[PDB]
Amino acid sequence: MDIDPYKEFGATVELLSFLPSDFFPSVRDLLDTASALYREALESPEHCSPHHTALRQAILCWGELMTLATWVGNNDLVVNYVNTNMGLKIRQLLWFHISCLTFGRETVLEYLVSFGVWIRTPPAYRPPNAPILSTLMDIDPYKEFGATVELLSFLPSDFFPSVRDLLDTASALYREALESPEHCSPHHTALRQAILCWGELMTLATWVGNVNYVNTNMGLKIRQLLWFHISCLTFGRETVLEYLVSFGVWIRTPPAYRPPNAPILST
Amino acid sequence: MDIDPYKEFGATVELLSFLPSDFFPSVRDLLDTASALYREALESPEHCSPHHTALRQAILCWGELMTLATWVGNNLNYVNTNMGLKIRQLLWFHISCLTFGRETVLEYLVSFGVWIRTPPAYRPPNAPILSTLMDIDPYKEFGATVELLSFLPSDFFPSVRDLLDTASALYREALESPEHCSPHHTALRQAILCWGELMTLATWVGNNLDLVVNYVNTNMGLKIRQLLWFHISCLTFGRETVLEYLVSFGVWIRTPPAYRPPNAPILST
Amino acid sequence: MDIDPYKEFGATVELLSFLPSDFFPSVRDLLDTASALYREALESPEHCSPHHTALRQAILCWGELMTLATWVGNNLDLVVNYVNTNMGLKIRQLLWFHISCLTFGRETVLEYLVSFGVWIRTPPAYRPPNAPILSTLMDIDPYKEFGATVELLSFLPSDFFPSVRDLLDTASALYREALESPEHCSPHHTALRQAILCWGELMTLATWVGNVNYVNTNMGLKIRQLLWFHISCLTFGRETVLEYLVSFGVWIRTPPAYRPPNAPILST
């Protein structure tokens, strides 16, 4: 399954390769621009726009890569690797969705065409001023979906399936829905990023070998985002919101006072 | 979470500390004031006001501090300085809401609060005093008693850390609301703050002279886990369902194991 | 109480950190712009815009700070570089904002601070060499728009106003959800956010000068009058305190053994 991270928004990954690599601002310069304008709209308990759901998973995915990169620095050079291969990818996702929130949807799509002809022409007949976008923070990933990360701390560590076992569930059930140019739900917008957040993390975990604590620290965090959004699409949206409450009272009761089988999720 | 126990009444905790610290009466003058006027109403099985639900837990939380302060003095002064000022304000504000109205005391904290602030030559000569001229049960207004909650086993109720974060994962945006959504919410806002100042005293004696945290969890931590489990379940499953759960589960643990249903009764949606 | 000067008008403090420090024109070149375009409206007794109420107090905040900087130059050159780095730069923003919001409208500045954000975030090999500058659409009485004058409040004696800490605690206890809110709700709240923040800069400078107890009898008294007048305008209404000020005038002007010994207290 090959998921284009911005295909629902009108762009492609190769149309956005019109811009050079060293055109996007730094992640320090992108996260502060996000928090200066959209702070109460990013910490909001509802999804105002499909860029807002896409930007929330992009900020949190950089939080995982920075937690992973400084981990292997303890156990100097990996920061030079992460800022060239996948740190550039987060800079594309942060730049695109910030400039979609500010300067509309179609204006930044017309900007990639208007930059696509500026960089293309020879330097003799090029204007000196490149085209630029003219006149018009700890977030919770489940916050617009109703649950919190505290509510999913009641589920034990072995309740979730494997991450390879969970990509196969989404790739079989919802493949032509996740690889579509539409959204069709705010869950598919959030689910498409968690595929690539794990996909752009496993290439770092493959490169760092040339030990595997990732499957209890970062992978357990991605097995929650995969399970919550698959079950939000399969067994309804609010049925899983009331299932976690019913699992909350089961896991809180001590042994010899609860039924021995955990409550399953169905219908 | 940070819960303000005046927030649903229109007042804030910094509007109450607008006044001087020594203005509020003693706990003995305030507890016998509420017993002289509302002992026939605080012991009643109805709410009749959201101030009565807040006042029943404010008296009971002071009884929990005066069962721990007697224990830490006996098994080796601080309460009246820190915890005593916070309990004198809850008794003063809730009595004066029931006696003089809720809106008059809110315009009294503003008017008297600027009266100290003005210089003593350009202010009115006298302070503008306000005049329009006991054993209680925390479940009795809800339907249960202490006896029905003790009918269930003592180690049935979960840990205190397991119950605080359930409220923070289900009703954090409703416990910190400026509106009392239910009398279960008003009785629950006091219980988080009662355990908050109960544990705050326990860390101070832990640094002063751990036996005390083993003592609190026996007879005070168990008493907190009762109404923390009770008010969370009554918000989730309804008050008319938890009362049947205590009856259903209470008979189930008493019957012999060969003639009971094989799994314990549990509440769910 | 952490009050914010721009949060009422739409922007924030950190959103104005998009622009660098050395972008704003000097305090000399900004006051020459204000007096050239808005002098018949800044000195007018009307409430013409909430930018005018914030600009009337921002000039007099600098007019009181420069007095303190001139005063410490005698009774000890090392303070001018301080008052141009921490203050100065903090008041160059508040003067640049309300002049440019009066001139080009308020919503154009908020789309300009974003548009200078994208010009400053891009690497220098791809941004244009031209900045995205915007070009398309004297003494001030601080009480005159509200009804009173300075000399009407000189009749109240120096031992009549409470201290600044007693008058700032009255603010955060009575009006804190209305001062910190992003709405105006009155011309008094807008004039009260600046008087609190101007005291934040005076006590900051007075601390570093002592690293000076005349501040609360030459400049703190002007803050004690401004904080008293706007708290009383919200507590008792505006007409009542203006009617009380003429009733203190006929009291404090009569000699002793002809006036009642009790001052005419504010009521209602």
Author numbering:
A (entry chain D): 1 to 75, 195 to 255, 285 to 358, 375 to 431
B (entry chain L): 1 to 76, 199 to 255, 285 to 360, 372 to 431
C (entry chain E): 1 to 76, 195 to 255, 285 to 358, 375 to 431
Reproduce the article's own wording on this structure.
The genetic fusion of these monomers using a sequence encoding a Gly-Ser linker ensures that the genetically fused pairs will dimerize within the assembled VLP, termed tandem HBcAg (tHBcAg). The genetic fusion of two monomers results in a tandem HBcAg construct and the introduction of an anti-SUMO Affimer into the first MIR of this tandem construct forms the basis of our VLP capture system, VelcroVax.
Notably, as a result of the tandem arrangement of VelcroVax, the T = 3 configuration does not conform to icosahedral symmetry. Each VelcroVax subunit comprises two connected HBcAg monomers, only one of which is modified with an Affimer, generating an imbalance between what would be true icosahedral asymmetric units. As such, this configuration was termed T = 3* rather than T = 3, and 5-fold (C5) symmetry was imposed during image processing rather than icosahedral symmetry (I1), which was imposed for the T = 4 VLP. Freshly purified VLPs were used for cryoEM data collection, and structures were determined for both T = 4 (at 2.9-Å resolution) and T = 3* (at 3.6-Å resolution) configurations. Both the T = 3* and T = 4 reconstructions had clearly resolved density for residues corresponding to the helices of both HBcAg molecules within the tandem VelcroVax sequence. Unsurprisingly, given the presence of flexible linking sequences, the SUMO-Affimer, the second MIR, and the internal Gly-Ser-linker lacked clearly defined density. For both T = 4 and T = 3* VLPs, maps low-pass filtered to 10 Å revealed additional density above the four-helix bundles consistent with the expected size of the Affimer, confirming that Affimers were likely present but were not resolved to high resolution. Because of its unique symmetrical properties and therefore much more limited chance of success, focused classification was not attempted for T = 3* data.
